[PDB]
């Protein structure tokens, strides 16, 4: 059949920790229409021409709400709190990232705000005084995802849940911050692909 | 012969103690209010020059109450229409008067019913709270900027403390903390939504025919505590076209397990703030040190910078955890924590290294840290002659910790033994405020070479008036008991001989970390009782009294009313077997917690005591507030400590009151210890059928500080004591 | 010297006055409950039958305190789970027990927390009030029919009265009035929406850690008052398929111009009712008589049928305007109407005639009509020997008004002088309950020939056990002060001698239309004080006392707290000048109004009295409720009576309290005279600076009726009296 980037523009976008992997366009792959409707703000990854033309095997996508006023924590090399807790870039496959801004047209629906976990550490000990942060894999979700994955209402929201064994056996504390809503919605597009059916 | 200290002299305050209250405004200049005139004084020379005139403020139709000075000296802040709300909180009107233009600023006045106004430490920035909202003025003749929009009456408190925090945690109405150079404003937000209220009727003046009912958010023992949040707002980036953004600093995740408190906030340097948090089970506290980054403008508190204080035997701190004292660079600080032996001493702390090195050691407790410079550190301790009552000033050398110099040990050994200090801005000068066995003496010193500059006050005319009149004499000693010295005081009558037996009134507080045998000169009701009626008034420091190590203080942990009561009874027994005390005329009286101790001693059935007064006593620990009761008893949860919660009631000992005479006094409009408590005591006493005396004082707070009510209550107490002792 | 009437004898009720309480179910018979068994007594021949046994009582799972009998005798109503709310109001649970089947009814039982249940006068119709809504059951085993849908807690009362009407106007909790044969149900609906609320805290048992607040609609003096409506529903046309409807009988046109009350409701004949309305300015009352209209289905009231009672010199009636006593045909009625001279007497009325002809005349007052069959009218009056303190039963022939016979004057002149009577259904038999100077004696009489059939109770055992105690005497006499006869009573100690001087305690009530000098046998605190402490307890009837003419009673109109105070002072002066009263040991005590009179006497500065007790006194008349204050003082508008409202306060004369000893006792949960009044008294007394004693009684009503608190308060007043009089 014929497939394209239709499921990315439906409903409300999720946040950076609540990221949605999707695998589609197996038979045919469509080029330069998601970039046409949603303009690009930067393109630097470890080229547009190499990912534009050339057949592939399996293409995956990543999209989440990500403001442009804060961009520097997610780099190929960085020490941001978002990189260590929420999402880390995957380097196992040729991938490139894209930050997009919604135009004045209201094709997408805006969420309440942009939110992200500031602390996802594990509490363990006799008096629960030893603190150990939980770093996350680039291809795995943070364990603080179940603390309101829709979003955080205020800046200081903390939600705690006792972890199951088979996970560490300590109390988990998840604190999520929030940034104020901008004028228009803003998208973080990350595309990974590996080398044959997915061809333009 | 000569006259004695009468009750009229005490109530009318004829013999008035002269004080010298000065506020430092610079390195070497301080203010003084002499004859309703603000006077600038010089520390080095002593010459005084006039700062504010008489007529410059009385030209208005409202009499001023107090003055606040800007650090630059450009403006004076005057307050009037003073209305007291609680012990610390009040509402008043404010106005700003310029000193260069010498006129009043009526451009944008501070609105009426202002809750709390503070100046910036430098410059002339203002931060006043109105309707539980934070307003900041860069200049007094400029429009104000609104910081918090979520303030609400008795629900959300922004920048001002609620009832429980003001009474116990912060001991103040202020929750605003400026940066050291007046750039960042730090405020705390208190949420009171799920906390239950307390209702007491307020029968106002006779014109009003329907009494009002007061609603106070009051978390009792086992109730839900208020939720605290912490914010810091940058005041340099303020604009009138957009809302100010406040960056929230979250609590450490060790405290996010359950309920927690914010107990101390201290600014380290211009971009670093140190927060101290206290758990609901007040035996585990962590200090959070947060830095301000420039890349994001978010306050980051590293895990490695957290410092953990815990107590395995009792509660951390004396009442609240002690504040740190940072150095100039802010990379290290000095803090007072308990050592391995159980005595509070000073640790040199590093903001990155967890361990502390003790710089003081011994069998004495460091009372507090007063001033820190790069060369020396000044502190107050009770080391000198080993008396826990006495206080003296010591300075230690930061380079060599074994060289300790005392600055108030030998200034006046027979007169001044309880010293208090007040350093300058650079701590170049300190005014010593002794209040020892003699009259209070106020001296001014310079810290460059510890030379006495002059004497500010010595109460000469008061000395003549007191040498005219017969006055009681104090006596400080101790008893051995269970191989641990316990100190006591006795206000002996004039011309006191051991052969004649005197009646005893055991003035008792016996609270946790309370001192009642200090060398402090006071003109109180006990001086009238000793001087006129010839009554030995005594106080005791049993188990739970502070400044004597954690072994004594923490013996009363999770058990109130069973140990200090036994120590008070034992002290009465020892006093009776001293020889000069009539055993048949021993009484007991106390205030608040002292009333609870008095009620428990009378209900213990020991038979030592004849009559007892308990003004505003504590009855059941499930009626007092959450912080104070849970610090020393824990939650009233029936798997943890409900047995001692239900065993430590006065009403369980109501049958034993038949052998003693009880006088129960309480205020109807009390907010600290409610009228419910004395209502329950009276209900138990009339259900058992015990004859007792009672008295209620309407529209009276816990202090009962109104002059007519104070005179009436002390006259009634004197009448009850005289009728109990059958004094001529 | 045998034993005396001790305090514990009064407190523990060792000497119990035996009561013979009976209820007539028919002309012939009556029921007397004895040994927890119900017995039918045939009044002619004795004939002690049985009605209920112990088996019904112990077969149920809960205790039963009160019973009610259906008039046909086929059902008994049992009351359990008694929870008292006010003086007359209560809530309880009910169940109907059939007697024909000897089984308990289990279908559609009366719901829990039912405010008021009443039986129909004939048949077995049952109407009860639950959640301020009226439910009518034709049969006890049938579902109820809802009458009112507008019931609301503390807002709208249907079939029951609110606080003010129950306390003052109706003196009962029942606002339901059945038709004479149980066809119509007439109820009054009360609106409480603009009535301001009183709020006093309620400290419950020790488990409750937060005191509840009691919210009561309490119309104070000059405030908004409840609005009363009237309705009549038809129980014969009750159907479950549709809502029952009622017809509102409106007030007369002379009452709707201003605020009005509804004081008395009486079913005149089988199909007509006689409503009695009273103005807010309580000196103008109009009785409205309304007839049922069969053609229209509504109730019409004629202007010519209205009868107007007026009082120029003061208020109308004694407390409330008296109820009429209609004849059998309903074409005439008898009412107590004040004469032109002032004394209240029976006046024969007609429905369509304005004028009435008085049937009794003299310088005495008729207390009230009791019964009339067709030819004699039975009334109680104080005509005998010119004693307003004595009551006797009189009968008068209807045809010839000169024929007046006393049925209780000569029965026992030396023992009984205070008669109260209870009649049968057709008034052929009446039980005379004399409580005169002697012990209470109960007799049974037949009205046909006025012969004593038998005595029901004569207190033989109490007369046996009263020989071992020194009972106090009782002297009733008069003094002539202002050319008028003023009566007084004295409880004298045994072996009383005129030579020896005794202490005098003036037990004073002094309320408007209050008799304190009657010949009623009492076993109370005065008996203990006279017998044991040898204290003369005296009472006086000054200006404002009732049953002595309108000239004495209405002299206090619009001036409260002036003439009764000087009357009490002059009575004390006369008592001290008689000779047997010690002039330096005179005290005074009172309850409610008595406390107010005691407070104004002590604050008057007369100096006659030594000490005083005021148990729940009235302080300011703006604090007390609207009906009682406005009846004798008028509204406190600035242009009518505000001057004497602000001149007749206790707090205005607190300066003169320094010469006397004051004891101030008040219950915190008091709803009649709130704690606000004693709080204001205490505040004024500590503002002036007067030493006095006090005691609050938590969770206590106006009467202090709980046994432990009653014993404690009487022990404390005994201790205060003994200490004041310098007695052992
Ligand atoms: C101060 O504390 C109170 C509670 O102690 C806070 O009120 C709470 O506000 C949250 C919203 O942030 C409410 O949650 C909401 O509940 C509704 C109903 O269950 C639900 O439909 C929503 O999806 C949301 O979960 C919460 O119920 C409410 N709690 C109350 C009213 O007891 C209050 O927000 C705090 N103050 C500030 C300034 O945050
Ligand atoms: C602070 O006090 C709490 C209880 O008030 C202590 O917690 C208990 O410690 C014992 C020690 O074995 C355990 O058995 C209990 O299960 C603990 N209870 C709870 C609720 O945690 C605690 O040890 C104290 N000291 C700290 C926190 O340093
Ligand atoms: C600053 O914040 C406050 C609080 O959010 C804003 O005030 C509210 O604004 C909304 C939107 O106009 C109104 O619906 C509310 O009624 C306002 N509440 C109050 C109490 O005023 C305010 O508008 C903000 N100011 C700016 C400049 O954005
Ligand atoms: C008050 O202290 C603050 C905190 O350091 C100062 O703010 C910084 O000042 C430095 C230079 O001293 C600048 O490089 C930073 O950009 C400033 N940061 C911010 C957030 O303002 C401030 O300058 C000081 N004010 C005064 C008058 O000395
Ligand atoms: C109870 O009294 C009512 C009121 O009079 C009686 O009802 C009336 O009875 C007469 C006699 O038959 C009728 O003519 C009327 O139409 C009835 N009026 C109403 C409104 O019902 C009733 O009969 C009496 N009860 C008994 C059992 O006789
Ligand atoms: C009880 O009284 C209140 C007022 O005292 C009544 O409320 C009024 O109802 C009328 C409807 O006829 C409205 O026009 C008024 O505006 C209402 N006033 C207020 C203050 O609410 C209420 O209806 C009465 N209740 C009953 C059952 O009679
Ligand atoms: C009798 O009257 C009551 C009150 O007027 C009726 O109850 C109301 O019925 C309506 C629907 O018809 C509801 O919307 C209301 O909520 C009801 N009120 C209450 C207090 O229950 C009742 O339906 C009527 N019954 C008949 C048989 O007419
Ligand atoms: C009921 O009492 C009121 C007030 O006590 C009387 O009203 C006064 O009447 C006199 C004589 O007419 C006037 O001089 C006053 O101005 C009235 N006062 C007010 C406030 O209206 C009233 O007349 C009395 N009613 C009767 C029938 O005697
Ligand atoms: C100022 O007022 C005080 C007291 O009000 C008075 O003693 C003094 O003389 C006045 N003048 C100066 C210059 O202090
Ligand atoms: C005291 O005198 C010195 C000069 O000797 C002067 O500089 C100083 O300002 C004076 N102090 C005051 C407060 O006027
Ligand atoms: C405060 O009250 C006074 C008294 O009327 C008034 O003159 C003044 O304007 C008020 N303050 C403000 C800011 O309105
Ligand atoms: C404490 O209370 C419990 C139960 O209430 C009881 O078993 C125990 O004996 C009490 N301990 C005392 C009174 O010392
Ligand atoms: C019923 O019980 C009471 C006491 O409970 C007893 O005095 C009485 O004799 C009993 N009567 C019968 C008939 O059993
Ligand atoms: C007693 O009363 C019963 C019914 O109550 C009656 O049958 C009996 O005849 C009466 N005894 C007499 C009249 O002697
Ligand atoms: C009253 O309460 C009891 C127990 O609470 C219950 O058994 C009974 O059914 C209730 N009455 C009614 C009418 O529901
Ligand atoms: C009330 O007292 C005042 C005294 O200030 C007096 O002038 C006035 O006449 C009095 N009013 C009366 C007695 O009605």
Author numbering:
A (entry chain B): 385 to 430, 433 to 581, 586 to 590
B (entry chain A), C (entry chain C): 39 to 766
Which passages does the manuscript contain on this structure?
Merbecoviruses from bats, pangolins, and hedgehogs pose significant zoonotic threats, with a limited understanding of receptor binding by their spike (S) proteins. Spike (S) protein is the major viral surface glycoprotein of MERS-CoV and forms homotrimers. For the MERS-CoV S-trimer, NTD is known to mediate cell adsorption by binding sialic acid, while RBD is known to bind the human dipeptidyl peptidase 4 (hDPP4) as the entry receptor. The S2 subunit mediates membrane fusion and exhibits a higher level of sequence conservation among CoVs.
Here, we report the cryo–electron microscopy (cryo-EM) structures of the GD-BatCoV and SE-PangolinCoV RBDs bound to hDPP4. The GD-BatCoV and SE-PangolinCoV RBDs exhibit weak and strong affinities for hDPP4, respectively. In the complex structure of GD-BatCoV-RBD:hDPP4, the total buried surface area (BSA) is 1586.9 Å2 with 764.4 and 822.5 Å2 on RBD and hDPP4, respectively. In region 2 of the GD-BatCoV-RBD:hDPP4 complex, RBD hydrophobic residues L509GD (β6), Y544GD (β8), I557GD (β9), V559GD (β9), and V561GD (β9) form a hydrophobic cluster with hDPP4 residues Ala291DPP4, Leu294DPP4, and Ile295DPP4 (region 2). In region 4, Q540GD of GD-BatCoV-RBD forms a single hydrogen bond with the glycan linked to hDPP4 residue Asn229DPP4 (region 4). Therefore, the interface in the GD-BatCoV-RBD:hDPP4 complex is substantially twisted by comparison with other RBD:hDPP4 complexes. We further found that the interaction between D541GD and Arg336DPP4 in region 3 could be a major determinant for the twisted hDPP4 binding by the GD-BatCoV-RBD. Although D541GD is conserved in SE-PangolinCoV, MERS-CoV, and HKU4-BatCoV, only D541 from GD-BatCoV-RBD forms a salt bridge with Arg336DPP4, bringing the Arg336DPP4 loop closer to GD-BatCoV-RBD, thus leading to the observed deviation in hDPP4 binding by the GD-BatCoV-RBD. Whereas hDPP4 binding by GD-BatCoV-RBD K505AGD, N513AGD, and Q540AGD mutants remained largely unchanged compared to the wild type (WT) (top), the D541AGD mutant, which disrupts an interaction with Arg336DPP4, completely abolished hDPP4 binding (top), highlighting its critical role in GD-BatCoV-RBD for binding hDPP4. In contrast, N229DDPP4 has a weaker effect for GD-BatCoV-RBD (433.3 nM versus 255.4 nM) and SE-PanglinCoV-RBD (111.8 nM versus 9.4 nM).
